């Protein structure tokens, strides 16, 4: 059996980035799907540390919190910068990605109809920091931090992909981020994963909105 197990609802959501990471790094993992019906049962939810998913297993290590899973995999697979200084920059990027993801999730699940217009208008200002970071790192020709891929790249990549769906052409204003999405998405293992049913046949979110 695989050493890694992802326990989550049948959506990309907060597991999209970690899955891209696993696939691109040639890692093996199992998908344990939890249906909304099974979740309503209460048993599993009550057993979850913070009463939520994703839940992740690495051998007998049981983790919760999507960013905890990303950092754990980043640590173990060498995707956390070349030194302590870079590790901090990677965290700074991931925390920024998380802040915007939280806003994105809030829109999708609690106020889509009445908040989309404002969200899209504010989007450029929210994406600009990442374009700025790319511009300050090798002209944005490599990764978000340093000269090697990090877990933050996978999280940012997902953030960009879902926003292109939410607001088509949103990266027209950000040449480096646009090229970055195309470049990372072309990586052999990641490219195959992104085109596979395992990824394509899952909705981005669980409420039919995107």
Ligand X SMILES: N[C@@H](CCC(=O)N[C@@H](CSN=O)C(=O)NCC(=O)[O-])C(=O)[O-]
> Would you tell me which residues interact with its own copies (CB under 8 A)?
49-51, 58, 61, 63-65, 67-68, 71-72, 75-76, 84-85, 87-89, 91-92, 95-96, 99, 102, 125, 129, 132-133
Q: How far is the C-alpha of 159 from the C-alpha of 165, rounded, in Å?
A: 10
Q: Is 78 in the site for Ca ion (CB under 5 A)?
A: yes
Q: Which of 20, 24, 66, 159 binds ligand X (CB under 6 A)?
A: 66
Pick 148 or 178: Cβ nearer Ca ion: 148
- 105 near ligand X (CB under 6 A): yes
Q: How many residues bind Ca ion (CB under 5 A)?
A: 2
148 binds, among Ca ion, its own copies, ligand X, none (CB under 5 to 8 A by kind): Ca ion
- Spatial contact of 107 and 116, defined as CB atoms under 8 Å apart: yes
In the annotated binding site for glutathione, the residues are: 8, 14, 39, 45, 52-53, 65-66
Site of interaction with Ca ion (CB under 5 A) = 78, 148
Site of interaction with ligand X (CB under 6 A) = 13-14, 45, 51-54, 65-67, 95, 99, 105
């Amino acid at each position: 059996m695989p050493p890694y197990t992802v326990v989550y609802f049948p959506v990309r959501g907060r597991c999209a980035a970690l899955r891209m990471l696993l696939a691109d790094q040639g890692q093996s993992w199992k998908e344990e799907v939890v249906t909304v019906e099974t979740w309503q049962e209460g048993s599993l939810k009550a057993s979850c540390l913070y009463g939520q998913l994703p839940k992740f297993q690495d051998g007998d290590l049981t983790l919760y919190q999507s960013n905890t899973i990303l950092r754990h995999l980043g640590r173990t697979l060498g995707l956390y910068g070349k030194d302590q200084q870079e590790a901090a920059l990677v965290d700074m990027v991931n925390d920024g990605v998380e802040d915007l993801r939280c806003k994105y999730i809030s829109l999708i699940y609690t106020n889509y109809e009445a908040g989309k217009d404002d969200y899209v208008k504010a989007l450029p200002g929210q994406l600009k920091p990442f374009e700025t970071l790319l511009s300050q790192n090798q002209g944005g020709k490599t990764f978000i931090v340093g000269d090697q891929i990090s877990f933050a790249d996978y999280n940012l990549l997902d953030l960009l992909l879902i926003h292109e769906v939410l607001a088509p052409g949103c990266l027209d204003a950000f040449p480096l981020l646009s090229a970055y999405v195309g470049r990372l998405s072309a990586r052999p293992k990641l490219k195959a994963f992104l085109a596979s049913p395992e990824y394509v046949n899952l909705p981005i979110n669980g409420n039919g909105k995107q």
